[PDB]
Amino acid sequence: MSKTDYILRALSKISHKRWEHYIINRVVHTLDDPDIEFVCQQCIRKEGHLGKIYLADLLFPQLNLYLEIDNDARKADAVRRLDIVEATGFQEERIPASNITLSEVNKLVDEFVRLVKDKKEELENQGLFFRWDYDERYSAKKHINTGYMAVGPNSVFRYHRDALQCFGYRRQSGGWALPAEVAQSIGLTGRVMVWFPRLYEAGEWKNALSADGNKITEQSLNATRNYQETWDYRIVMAHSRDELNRTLYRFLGVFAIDVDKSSDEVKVFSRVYSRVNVYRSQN
Template sequence: MDKLEFICRQLSKAENKIFEHYVITRIWHLLNDTDIKLITQQYVVRPEGRALTDMYFPQLNIHIEIDEGHHKKQVLSDKIREADIINVTGHEVLRVDVTKSLEVINSIVDNIVNKLKVAKKMKSDFKPWDFEAEQNPLTYISRGYIDLKDDVSFKTMVDAANCFGHSYKPNAIWKGVVKHPREDGKYIWFPKLYKNEGWDNSISNDENIITEVCLDKSKESTYPELKISGTKHIVFARVKSSLGDTMYRFKGEYEVVSDAIKERNKRVLKRVSTRVKTYNNVILSDTLAVPSLKTWNKK
């Protein structure tokens, strides 16, 4: 996928919502700036649950919400939802009321486009959107870290693991977790944070706590070294991207705080850092991968 396809697929997500589609496409085409990244139906964590905003510009920290007729019946809940988004992210939320006349809607859109242009101009650390670089491990290796605020996702586990000193080939396959090649007692973990094939995994609304429950007794004793209290995991959760593709999204570094060996089938991990150090790739032996991880793939 290239930048053009990404943009087209983002815009097409609203094509069945005619008013939303009109506003989103008008904003994008009037903005006319492919250095600015857009995301439609942006996932936002709220204190109690989650939300999807209609349009989001991550470099500018601005969300656009399009209010159709039914929003007139939920003014209070919309205000609470907007306050949650602002409080959690620190971002600005701009609204377009599509129950107004075409002339008024266009005027609101014009004002939003001007605000976006000014926001870009005023942002001293603005970096043009580089679609290819944002999913390339070399980007983060050369930077020296991965930070949660950058919303980093990779297409494969290999790409993520190679940010920490591994030199896996593109077709390398393993099942769910590998040892960190540079930091002892630390692992790179790719969990499914939902109920799946013998596991019931979940993440708290603020994403600070991961709970893992084994539903299959035959797997309770699998890889005990990964489950001891104090063991740390750099987590890339298996997720669906805004376009429906499988991705591995960075969630932070977590530490086991509830020992699965003592509790038999359950462990709890707490986030201890939102930034992790990256390393140049080196040639490593196969012994660094956790061997025979068939059952770990279920997690």
């Protein structure tokens, strides 16, 4: 789907909520910068472990900013396809969709579009800002540039071959063991794999994700596939879906078996690191 195709669907998909459509459409158009990513109607986890999902109306991946304008339909469904993103150290600006006039409302938008304008001066003054690159939407490139990978809007991957490239894949269905070299290089101590899990009942696994974002539970339905956990860390790239029901893999963080809580039938993994360095064979 083309960038414009993307841009044109983004602005036009918000016709349910009339107030939201205005304010979204105003700001994006107002701003008139095609070097700036924006996401619409992205469900979200916010600061503090709450298990509560919020709907962010505008999110700018490349600045840690989202706009909120104050739904159980979407929230329940996105969760259902793990279409969530953890937006921590993400600035929240807000706009009230009640008890206000347009002349004030698009004053706020006028103010907020300055933020977006000004919070990009910093990232350009500090040489951290990298112009929106749509065609590398779901690739490694960003991550190899940065050298690390956090939970966020950025760490999403179309295919397995795309996340494994951040961990030395040169050539990857199911799981991939990092070579002991890279494992140690990126600063994980042990025996380490990337896991591409389903986080629901699927074939022979009834898996699950805590509301927290912080505990994976996995339960084998078939028992000939009960096993002993030999891995010290799992880097988890969970199966999830688009608004258009396409498969993406979301980086959930680096997890590790909780051994007391775990069993042969039912293992429990806790989240240990919410980011991870990425491996380039350098210096």
